[PDB]
Amino acid sequence: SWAWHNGKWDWH
Amino acid sequence: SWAWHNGKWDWH
Amino acid sequence: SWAWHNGKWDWH
Ligand SMILES: [Cl-]
Ligand SMILES: [Cl-]
Ligand SMILES: [Cl-]
Ligand SMILES: [Cu+2]
Ligand SMILES: [Cu+2]
Ligand SMILES: [Cu+2]
C-alpha cells in the first residue's frame, strides 16, 4: 500500500 | 498481486 | 517495484 516517509508518498 | 479474501479482491 | 527476470518485467 502507499506509505508516507520523509514528506513523500511511495509504495511501502 | 491481487488476492481474494472474504469476498473482496485486494492487493496481498 | 517492477523487477526484471528472464527477459520479463513484472512486479517483484
Ligand atoms: Cl508527497
Ligand atoms: Cl470483489
Ligand atoms: Cl519485457
Ligand atoms: Cu503497503
Ligand atoms: Cu500478490
Ligand atoms: Cu519491488
Exposed e or buried b per residue across B1-12, where buried means at least 16 C-beta atoms within 10 angstroms of its C-beta:
eeeeeeeeeeee
**Ligand 4 centre and the CA of A3: distance in Å?**
6
Burial of A5 (0-12, 13-18, 19+ CB in 10 A): exposed
**Ligand 6 centre and the CA of B4: distance in Å?**
21
**Ligand 6 centre and the CA of C4: distance in Å?**
10
Please give the full DSSP string across C1-12, using - where no structure is assigned: -EEEETTEEEE-
Rg of the Cα atoms in chain A: 6
What's the grid cell of residue A9?
A: 508518498
**Ligand 1 centre and the CA of C2: distance in Å?**
21
Tell me if B11 sits within 8 A of A1, measured CB to CB.
yes
What method was applied to determine this entry?
X-ray
